[PDB]
């Protein structure tokens, strides 16, 4: 790792992150076919950024670029997955060069799989949603069919920035809105002793502990009710997607206006 050499080390670290894709996917039982597709995409983009003649390298929410490629891979293959779904996966040897690497570059390369950024980067480069949204909605199917019809009409009618996922998510909202055992201190002591001595990270264990704590207590009338339910849904949707309110409400308003114009 050096000027040129630093750039090379950063690229090697990013390739190792692709390994994370290998590890996550295999743990999955998806299509090994998957590896094949993932391998083509990495070759197209990375080489090109490199291709524009030894000027400037590149930087990214490095974690998000790999995720976008993984997400992109799924879009072609027709796996049913969503950006929000990808976020859930993220929650739950190494070359020296990596140790010896530009500070900034090393930080960018980082680890681990603002609301606006994840959605924006992917953009720059129906059946699937049905199950999840229905479940959140809790509708047996009547809701599903109508939303399906509405969205199709809206496309045809073309009321309709934001990605189709955003539009579709928005329109669902509109339609539904109006439906007419323990180590103990011992471990601490040992750690302290080792630090006295030269010593040289996150693990699941953490996840399990959190889950256990949560389980153990750890963590106009009709019209009015309908409105409240719908609102709950908006808030909760944002959180689950691992996306914001400012970016959802605006999109929904725009879609509704377009639909009204088309109908009129």
């Amino acid at each position: 790792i050096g000027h040129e050499a630093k750039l090379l080390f950063l690229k090697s670290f990013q390739f190792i992150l692709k390994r994370q894709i290998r590890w996550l996917i295999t743990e999955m039982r998806f299509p090994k076919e998957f590896e094949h597709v993932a391998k083509i995409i990495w070759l197209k983009i990375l080489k090109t950024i490199n291709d524009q003649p030894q000027e400037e390298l590149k930087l990214q929410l490095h974690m998000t670029s790999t995720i976008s490629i993984l997400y992109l891979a799924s879009t072609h293959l027709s796996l049913p997955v969503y950006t929000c779904d990808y976020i859930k996966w993220i929650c739950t040897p190494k070359s020296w060069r990596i140790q010896l690497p530009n500070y900034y570059v090393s930080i960018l390369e980082g680890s681990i799989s603002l609301y606006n950024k994840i959605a924006l980067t992917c953009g720059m480069i129906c059946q699937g949603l049905l199950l999840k949204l229905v479940m959140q909605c809790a509708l047996p199917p009547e809701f599903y069919f109508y939303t399906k019809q509405v969205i199709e009409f809206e496309e045809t009618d073309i009321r309709n920035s934001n990605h189709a996922e955003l539009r579709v998510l928005s329109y669902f909202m509109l339609t539904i809105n109006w439906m007419l055992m323990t180590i103990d201190q011992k471990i601490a002591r040992r750690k302290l002793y080792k630090i006295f001595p030269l010593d040289r990270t996150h693990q699941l264990t953490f996840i399990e502990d959190l889950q256990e704590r949560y389980a153990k207590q750890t963590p106009p009338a009709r019209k009015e009710a309908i409105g409240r339910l719908l609102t709950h849904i908006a808030s909760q949707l944002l959180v689950d997607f691992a996306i914001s309110k400012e970016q959802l409400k605006d999109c929904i308003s725009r879609i509704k206006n377009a639909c009204l114009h088309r109908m009129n």
């Binding site: 027709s78 129906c126 059946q127 049905l130 199950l131 047996p140 199917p141 599903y144 069919f145 399906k148």
Partner: peptide
């Protein structure tokens, strides 16, 4: 398209 079709699914919903 396939996904949409799945959503037989409609028939099931109706039955429910």
């Amino acid at each position: 398209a396939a996904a949409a079709a799945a959503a037989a699914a409609a028939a099931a919903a109706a039955a429910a």
